[PDB]
Amino acid sequence: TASIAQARKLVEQLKMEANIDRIKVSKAAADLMAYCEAHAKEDPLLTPVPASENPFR
Amino acid sequence: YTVGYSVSLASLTVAVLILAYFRRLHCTRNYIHMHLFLSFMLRAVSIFVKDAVLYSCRVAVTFFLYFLATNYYWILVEGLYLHSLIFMAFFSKYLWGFTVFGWGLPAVFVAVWVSVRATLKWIIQVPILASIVLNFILFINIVRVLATKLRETNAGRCDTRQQYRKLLKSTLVLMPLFGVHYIVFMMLFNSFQGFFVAIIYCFCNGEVQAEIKKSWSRWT
Amino acid sequence: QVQLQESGGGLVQPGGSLRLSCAASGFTFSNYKMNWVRQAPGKGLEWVSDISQSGASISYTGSVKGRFTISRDNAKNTLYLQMNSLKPEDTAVYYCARCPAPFTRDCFDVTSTTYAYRGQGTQVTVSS
Amino acid sequence: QSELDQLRQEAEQLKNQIRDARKACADATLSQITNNIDPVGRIQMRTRRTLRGHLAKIYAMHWGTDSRLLVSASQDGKLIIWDSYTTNKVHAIPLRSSWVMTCAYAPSGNYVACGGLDNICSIYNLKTREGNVRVSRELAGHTGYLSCCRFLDDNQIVTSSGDTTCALWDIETGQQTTTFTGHTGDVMSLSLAPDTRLFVSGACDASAKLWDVREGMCRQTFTGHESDINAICFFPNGNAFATGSDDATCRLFDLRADQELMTYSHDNIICGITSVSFSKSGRLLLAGYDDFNCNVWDALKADRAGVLAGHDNRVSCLGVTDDGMAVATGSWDSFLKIWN
Amino acid sequence: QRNEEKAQREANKKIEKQLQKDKQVYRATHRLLLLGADNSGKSTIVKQMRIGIFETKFQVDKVNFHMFDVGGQRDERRKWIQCFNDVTAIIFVVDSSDYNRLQEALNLFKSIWNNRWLRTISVILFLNKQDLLAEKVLAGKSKIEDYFPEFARYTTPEDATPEPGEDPRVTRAKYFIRDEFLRISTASGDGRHYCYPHFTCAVDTENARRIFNDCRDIIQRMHLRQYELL
Ligand SMILES: Cc1cc(N2C(=O)NC(=O)C2(C)C)cc(C)c1CCS(=O)(=O)N1CCC2(CC1)N=C(c1ccc(OC(F)(F)F)cc1)NC2=O
């Protein structure tokens, strides 16, 4: 039946997820910090731009 | 005395400010309240001015009669707008249709009194009597509907005493005790009429009280 | 990972007793309203009993009033169902469905066929 | 049952060995690395515009690539295309079904999609020969309500649905080229990667899944939420994403690390999250809540930077411009407000 | 130069005129969510009311209604039910004869009543299939006490108004099922939303004036609530 065969695919899918190259969280968090630091000056919401450069003002 | 006449105008101007400066306190019924509050304040203004020129000319006399008929015509329509919602508003402009009725129609037959007076009572008085009588007719209809609905909220799944409190409080805030004072009379009553209305209709109002709390929460 | 692992259940003679145990994990057990549901052989899922967050509303399905009783232990993160007099009609797979939202008194879709926040269930059989 | 017991054990033991692999990578936490950097401080945005004209609640919205035009869907049958700079309404599309639950604006700015309980992501042609707006073609084939459909290309669109299934579509033919199966609950949100090579989708089973567009297979699944995931959004670089849920918590997940980096939660908040969005830099994390508010979060330190309190009913949708210049907030009070 | 701005401002007026016209039709119409079960008999009510989702428009006394039946979805309904937080009323249909499924209908009623986004909506309850309930009660095959033990200690309400010709045993069971639904209504939502129970059959000829009268009472109470008069 379908109920007994519904677990056939669940095992197969988890096998694909098991064999994945995982990096350390320490260097993973470094990439997020580096991206934000390198793009901080390009974020109008982060740093309120002058009213002359704001189309909504 | 004088302090009593300050609170009549002072509270009513605060009432219009809260209703007008705010966007949440809107829709037709709140626009109706402002004209009622404006008329109550405008009556108190014309009371002293007329007395000051007379005892305390004819310019203040004609203004006094205009605003006296304006109060009972804005009490009438406000009960007329509520009557429309319960009965003849299941298919819903209307708001600006009778805004002329509120101010303009009281004025026109005042000028008739002036026109006849310009040479050579009932011209101005009994039109107000008709408004008072008609307003009482609407008041009786509404309290019967309120009583009808209170006993059918959940069939018998309520409390008779609790629905008595709901009926009594609702009845108090609609009975035209100002209209009966006009016919009975024709001192201190004028002093508190303007300030008394602001406490119940704008201060005791349970939704503006939470609105200013929302206003204070946003700002502070 | 939200998990609900049922315990207990088995064969029992009519008139006996059976204590179910539902071990919860992956969420704050104290915030959620918990339910017991069952699926009889050849029948759809049926709601049995629920319990409030604190353990005040202890409503039952009516067919099991007097016999069944649900319990809750927020410290141990577990749910209970003490069945006191089992009838043959009670034979079903008893699940431990949890309500979807964490601060609501209404509970939706616990009896659905593919509810995500419901356990695998424990088999209860009554026969002579 | 004798052999089906093994299938349960095979999945359980293999799922168990995945956790220790993730536990080995978790040497530090995102709070430890980002504790040294100074905080953003106070964030105080102001309502630059408030867009009025929708009759019923605004349920979804989407910005354009030019960062000027918007599309907003309301539960009354209208799909209004706005203009942020001048507040003017460019178009007003009457829909067949009033219960529209999603809307999308094409990257080219030529088509607009929408759908809901009618089970159709209808494509609308804005730049036609006669200048009008008409239904281009209707993409039928979903068995559950359409929750999110997003333009992958001018001729491709990915859809989420309440039938636990996503699908890639070909607008020219009108058929599903790729089907994305694996979710158990209703799929509520969808977010494409910047490269449009992968996309994530959260569903009503407290789990998110990374899908490959050209393959149709699930790469990895993320867990950690306690309740239904309502919103999802990629990090600007494309290596992470955030998920809002009914837990009153947002969570940051890293694709390469395959773990949950950070949780954005406060004890005061006990209401669900409807929409999430990152800023252009990715430092700020916008989130729309059920308590009629929008909270700005520091994505690296998990601190409430600010609050966008300007709506009467629940905040239904959020959006940030591609140039990161402004943020818009739709709500159930039928008002779309621009913040900057 | 300014030609584009003149065109854009002139264009916005054309949409604004249409949106005001569409507002009149939207406000006049009353939207209704028809909710029920497979055995409730939803299609019977829809069919006899001859004026992904199925819509049914019917006009009563020059008042447009719009009944929405949502049958093209799955059994999980906690995400699309939020789309109907502003309907005028929810028409809840129940099969009175189907005893074992009454608790399932009671649970669904409790969820809708206590839902955060549906706390303001009033429910027009239709206890459908009354003729089959009378047949089952008089036959004596199935009993309420097995499925509802509290029935054995239930006295008929004094305000009951039975139809001309009805066994007192039938009336007792008929008003007990109604009382089960009204028990949930009174337990929460004090004055914010109410329930309108009705006994209906497959041959109830109008069955739409009751909706018309209930929707009229819902709007009237809504206006009175804004005045804090009820
Ligand atoms: C209906 C309504 C409801 C509201 N509310 C709202 O919106 N929220 C709310 O909570 C309430 C306040 C319910 C507000 C307004 C303005 C009105 C219209 C009110 S009126 O204009 O029709 N008119 C009614 C008649 C009128 C003048 C005003 N009243 C009195 C009067 C006398 C004595 C009284 O008390 C006591 F006897 F002295 F003890 C009390 C009244 N005498 C009059 O002649």
Author numbering:
A (entry chain G): 6 to 62
B (entry chain R): 191 to 246, 281 to 316, 319 to 346, 360 to 425, 445 to 478
C (entry chain N): 1 to 128
D (entry chain B): 1 to 340
E (entry chain A): 12 to 62, 206 to 384
The authors write:
PTH1R is a class B1 GPCR and is a major regulator of mineral ion homeostasis and bone metabolism. Conversely, activated PTH1R is internalized by β-arrestins and induces sustained cAMP production at the early endosome, which leads to adverse effects. Thus, G-protein-biased agonists are useful in osteoporosis treatment; however, the mechanisms of G-protein-biased activation are largely unknown in PTH1R. Recently, PCO371, a non-peptidic chemical PTH1R agonist, was shown to exhibit PTH-mimetic activity in vivo through oral administration.
Here we report the cryogenic electron microscopy structure of a complex of Gs and the human parathyroid hormone type 1 receptor (PTH1R) bound to a PTH1R agonist, PCO371. PCO371-bound PTH1R was mixed with the engineered mini-Gs heterotrimer and nanobody 35 (Nb35) to form a Nb35-stabilized PCO371–PTH1R–mini-Gs complex. Particle images were categorized by 2D and 3D classifications and then used to create a cryogenic electron microscopy (cryo-EM) density map at a global resolution of 2.9 Å. No clear density corresponding to the extracellular domain was observed, which was in contrast to the previously determined PTH–PTH1R–Gs complex structure and several structures of small chemical agonist-bound glucagon-like peptide 1 receptor (GLP-1R)–Gs complex. Instead, we observed a clear density corresponding to PCO371 in an intracellular-transducer-binding pocket formed by transmembrane helix 2 (TM2), TM3, TM6 and TM7, which was spatially separate from the extracellular orthosteric pocket. Notably, Tyr4597.57 (superscript numbers reflect the Wootten class B1 GPCR numbering) formed hydrogen bonds with the main-chain carbonyl group of Val4126.44 and PCO371, which stabilizes the PCO371–PTH1R–Gs complex. The carbonyl group of dimethylhydantoin (DMH) on PCO371 formed a salt bridge with Arg2192.46. Notably, the DMH group of PCO371 interacted with the carboxy-terminal hook of Gαs, which tightly packed PCO371 into the receptor core. In contrast to the extracellular portion, the intracellular portion of the TMD in PCO371-bound PTH1R exhibited the outwards movement of TM6, which is similar to the movement in the active PTH–PTH1R–Gs structure. This distinct extracellular conformation caused TM6 to unwind and become moderately kinked (approximately 145°) in the PCO371-bound PTH1R structure, which is distinct from the sharply kinked TM6 (approximately 90°) in the PTH-bound PTH1R structure. PCO371 acts as a molecular wedge that stabilized the significantly outwards conformation of intracellular TM6, which indicated that PCO371 preferentially activates G proteins rather than β-arrestins.
